[PDB]
Amino acid sequence: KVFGRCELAAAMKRHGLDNYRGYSLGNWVCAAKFESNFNTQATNRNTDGSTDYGILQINSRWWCNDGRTPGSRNLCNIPCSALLSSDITASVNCAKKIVSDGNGMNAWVAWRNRCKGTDVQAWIRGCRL
């Protein structure tokens, strides 16, 4: 599914992500836009042979099993495929872990380089939140 800017904002909120660990809702919609273009079916292979999965592009080297990344710790205890379904529940749940765990949202190269320090509130303008 390809979420609407506002529709996703709404959903991430409902899922308790607004201010989770101190990141405004906007920080999340932003990361997701540039990470996956609000498309949950998105995947991308990295050089190291891991693959990125979902709306938030969670990695298989650490967070989830897709059964063809070897070093693989599956800290999320989810098969990667799960992260691609139209309910974002599993992705949030896992994204929460990723972000708690030390580097905050820096863990998302995209967020860091294109989101960090821009007025991210602009992503949730218009929204009935």
DSSP letters for 12-51: HHHTT-TTBTTB-HHHHHHHHHHHHTTBTT-EEE-TTS-E
Q: Which residues contact 9 (CB under 8 A, 6 or more apart)?
A: 25, 26, 29, 123, 124, 127, 129
Q: Which two tokens stand for residue 11?
A: 């959903």
Catalytic residue among 7, 48, 52, 66: 52
Residue among 124, 64, 65 nearest 97 (CA): 64
Residue 20: strand pairing partners: 23
For the chain, what is the radius of gyration of the CA atoms? Answer: 14
Active site residue 52: yes
**Does 66 belong to an annotated binding site?**
no
Method of elucidation: X-ray
End-to-end alpha carbon distance in the chain: 21
Burial of 39 (0-12, 13-18, 19+ CB in 10 A): middle
Q: Which two tokens stand for residue 81?
A: 């495929």
C-alpha distance from residue 56 to each of 8, 44, 113, 126 (Å): 12, 12, 15, 22
Strand (E) or helix (H) holding 109? helix 109-114
Contact 40, 88 (CB under 8 A): yes
Which CATH code is given to the segment(s) 1-129?
A: 1.10.530.10
Residue among 2, 1, 4 nearest 128 (CA): 4
Catalytic residue among 7, 18, 35, 87: 35
Resolution (A): 2.0
Q: Work out the number of other CB atoms within 10 angstroms of the CB of residue 73.
A: 12
Query: What is the C-alpha to C-alpha distance for residues 113 and 104, in angstroms, rounded to an integer?
Result: 14
